[PDB]
DNA sequence: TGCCCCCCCTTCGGTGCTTTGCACCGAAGGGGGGG
C-alpha cells in the first residue's frame, strides 16, 4: 500500500522545464510484463492516466530480476534527472559485517514494493509522464504519471531512505537494545532476547511498518542462519563472503582484466594477501575495452597466486567491543601492502590492501604511513575507534625518519613485529660534509626552445666532465648532473648543486619513482656509503658552482 | 523579533561539503547535543531535498571535560555577503595586544536567542554520521544565529554592546574584543586579580544568557647567523646563501666580499680564514638583521598569510605576512606537550597559538601554509583542536634550501 | 538504453610556481560490491 507519510517537496532546477522525449520499442514479453504491472499499478493508485494537456514525456522499459518469474519496471529518466534539483544523499557508507556484535537472536527482513509504497510530491508528478507502447504496431500508447517514487528517478533512493528513517525512529527509541541495520529496504535486526521475546518484537516491528504502508513478504523474511546480507553470510560465530567466481579465459580483453581486478579487490576484504599490481599494469596505455591484452609472465604469476589464496576457505569473526582492535601490516613489494584487523590472534575481523602510488617520488616509510592512515579511517567508519598497530618497522627507523624529514608526520601507538621484509630507509644523507671525500660541483642547463642541454661537474681534485643532452628539460639536466657526480665518485662524496628542485626530491629520501632518471639516482644513492648534498644560489660567482656553470656553456 | 535579511555573494551557491567519519564518543556527543537543541527549537530535522551540507564534529576542552559541538562553516562564511559592506562589522581595538593578560570566553550560546532569516536557514544544513553506517545520516538546519557563522557576531552586534556597556562603563581600562563566538578580554591586573573580574563578567553574561594569554612575552625571533672561531668553505657557502635569501627582505645586505673568499674549486671541509673585509661585511649584516625591517605596515584590506617550518626538538618557526618578504611578525613556537612524540599535535597547537595571536593583534586569523601532507593532517587534527573558530589553510611541500629561521 | 552509495586503478585536465615542466589534486572513465 501507499504510506500516509507526508511527501517530500521537490523542485526542478531554476530556469528548467520538464522532459519531452519519445518512447522506443520493446519485446512482447516486455509489454505484458509492464501492462500487468501498469493497469495493476493503476489499480493500487501508484500511477494515473494522463492525456495531451500534460506536454511532458519520458520512455519506459523492463529488465529481468534475479528472483525468477518477477520483472522490474524502469523509466529512462536521464533527461528529468538532469533538470531535477540536487539532493544531499544520506547513505554515507556501506555497513560491514565485521562491525556487527554477536547477537543471541537475529532476523533479516526486506520491505516489499519499497519505492512504490512512498508517495511523490503532488506538484512534481506531472514531470514523470510516460507512455506504454504495446509492440509498437496499431497503437501509439497511453500516458500515465507516477504518484509514487519511480525507479530511475534521481530523487527516489534518498526520499525512500529518509522516509524509512522517520518510520523506524519511533520503534528504535522504544527498543534501544535492538540493533536495526537499515540499508535501503533491507533490515537486519539483532537482539539479546530469547527467541520467544525476539519474535514478539519482530512482528511488532512488522506491524508498525504495515500501518505505515510497508509490507514485509515472508519470502524474504529470514529467520535461521545462515542469513544472506549485503553480499555476505552470517553464521552465529562467523561470517563469509558469498562465493567469488573469477573469469577464466584463453584470450583476455581490457574489459575482462578490469572485471578480474574488481573481483580481487572485493575478495581482499577477507582473503589475506591478494595482489593486483601486475594485472592492473596491463590496463595502462590501452585504448579500447575490446582490445586483446596478452598477460605478461608477472601477471600470470600474480593471477595464479591469487587463485591459490581463493581456493582456501576463509571467514571473518564479529566485533567484541570489550577487547582492543589490532591492525597488522605486511609489505608485499612494488608499493603493495596487505593488512589484517583482529582482536584475538588468527581470528580476523577483516583484511584489506593498500597499493596506491601517491606522488611521482616516494619511499616505503611514506607509503607505510598512508596504509596506516587508510586503516585508521576504515576503523573509525566500521568500529568508531582506531586500532593498536603492529608494524614491520623498527623504532629506530621511524625515529630517524621523523627527525630528518621536514614535514610533520606521525603514527599512533604501534609495536614492532618482525615479519620481513621490514620497512627501512635505504640511505641517509649526512648532516655534515665528509672529511677526505671529494667535492663535486654540479650543474646542468637546457635550452627552453631547443630541447638541447648539458650536464657536468668540476671537482676539488681537478676532475671535470660535460655531457651533451638531447630532448631534455631544465630540471632533467640538473638531475642528470647529480647522476654523473654519483656515477664517477667513490663510496663517499660531497655534492653542491644550485637546483632546489633536485635537492627537494633527494632530501626526501625517495626509494622509488615514476621517473627512470630519478630511479637511477636512487640506486646510486643506495650503493654509496656517505653522501653530503649542499645547495648554493646560482649565478652569484660562488667558488666551484661558478666554474662548472662556466663550463656547461 | 525580526530576521535580518541575509544573502550569499552574487552568483555563489551554498556549501556542499561531505561529512567525514567520527569516533563513537564524538557521535554520541553530537546526538546528545543536537537532540536537546531540536527540543529547544534551535535546529530542525531536515531531509535530503535540502542539497547543502557542512561538516560537523566535536571538541572537548581538557579543563571543561564536556563536549562542544563545532560546525565547520568555513565554506559558508566565504560565500556569505560581507557585513562591513552593509556596515554591521566589529571594530578591532589596538589596545588589546598591550595588556598583561587576556582571557578567552566562549559566548556562542548568546547567538541562540536571535532567529535567522528563514530563506537563509537551508544553507546551514549538517549531517551526523552513524557507526558502521547502521543508519543513513541524520540532518538538521539552524533556526537561530549559528555558532561559527560569520553573520552571527555581526547581526548580534547591536545587542552585545548593550549587554557589555555596564561592565565596560565600570572597567574603562579592560578592553573587550569580539571575534566570532569568542570574547577576548585583557587587562593589567595581577594574575589572580585579573581572573576575578573575568568571573564577574561571566555572571553579568549568565544573567541574560581558555587559559590566560600573555602578549608582552610573544617574543619575536629574528634571523641570526652562526658565531664561530673557524669557518669551513661549507660554513661560508651556507652563510652566503642565507644572506642572499635575506636580501629579498632587508636592504643593502651584501655578499661580494664573502663570496670571493671562495674563489676556486675548493673542498667543503677546508677552513678558509676571514679577511678583514669579510669580517666587516658580516658584523655589518648581523645588525641589519638585529632590529626590524623599515617600511612594513599592516593593511586591513588584505589577507594575512602564515608559514610554519618544523625545526626539530619540538621547535616550530613561523612568519606572518601579507606581501611576500614583508613579514609583520616572525616567531618561534615551542612544544610543551611533554614526551616530544607527536608532530601533528604540536603543529595543530602551533596553528591555534599563531591564529590566536593574529586575533589579538589584528583582529582576524591568517591563512596557513602548513608543512604537512593533506592526508596526514586530515587523519588527526580534530583530535587536538580546542578553538571555536577554524582558520583557512593549505598544504605545502617545501624542503629547506637554507635554514633561514635557525 | 534507469536510480542512489561505498571501494580500487587509470587517465585527464586545472592550478601555481620569483615555472617555461612539474608536482599536486579532484573529477571522471573503467571495474567490483550493496539496495
Ligand atoms: N536494480 C535495482 C534494484 C533495486 N532498486 C531499488 C533499491 S531498493 C528498491 C526495492 O524495490 P522493491 O522492494 O519494490 O522490489 P524488490 O526487488 O525488493 O522485491 P520485493 O522486496 O519483494 O518487493 O528498489 C533499484 O532501483 N534498482
Ligand atoms: O583540509 C582541507 C579539506 O577540508 C575541506 C572540508 O572537508 O575544506 C575545508 O577547508 C578548506 C581549507 O581551508 C576550506 O577552503 C573549505 O572551505 C573548508 O570546508 C575540504 O573541502 C578540503 O579538501
Ligand atoms: Mg523490497
Numbering used by the authors:
A (entry chain A): 1 to 553
B (entry chain B): 5 to 213, 231 to 427
Excerpt from the paper describing this PDB structure:
Fortunately, the RT/RH domains of HBV Pol exhibit weak sequence homology with human immunodeficiency virus type-1 (HIV-1) RT. In particular, a consensus sequence present across multiple regions (i.e., Motifs A, B, C and D) that creates a dNTP-binding site (N-site) for HBV/HIV-1 RT is significantly conserved. We therefore newly generated HBV RT-mimicking HIV-1 RT mutants by substituting unconserved N-site residues with corresponding amino acids in the HBV RT sequence.
We determined a total of four ternary complex structures for HIV-1 RT3MB, including RT3MB:DNA:3TC-TP, RT3MB:DNA:dCTP, RT3MB:DNA:ETV-TP, and RT3MB:DNA:dGTP, to a resolution of 2.51 Å, 2.56 Å, 2.32 Å and 2.30 Å, respectively. Our ternary complex structures reveal that 3TC-TP binds at the N-site with its triphosphate moiety in an atypical conformation compared to the natural d-isomer form of NRTIs/dNTPs. Despite this significantly different spatial arrangement of triphosphate, the Mg2+ occupies an identical position, retaining an identical octahedral coordination. We noted that the side-chain of Asp110 (chain A) in RT3MB:DNA:3TC-TP was flipped and did not coordinate with Mg2+. The HIV-1 RT3MB:DNA:3TC-TP ternary complex revealed that the thioether moiety of 3TC-TP oxathiolane lies closer to the Met184 and ribose ring of the 3′-end nucleotide, and consequently the side-chain of the Met184 is moved backward, as in the conformation of Met184 observed in the RT3MB:DNA:ETV-TP complex. In addition, another cell-based study indicated the 3TC might not be incorporated to DNA differently from the AZT, a known polymerase chain terminator. The bound 3TC-TP conformation clearly indicates recalcitrance towards incorporation into DNA, and thus 3TC appears to be an N-site blocker hindering the binding of substrate dCTP rather than a chain terminator. Our data also demonstrated that HIV3MB is approximately 4-fold more sensitive to 3TC than HIVWT. Tight binding of 3TC-TP observed at the N-site of RT3MB may explain this result.
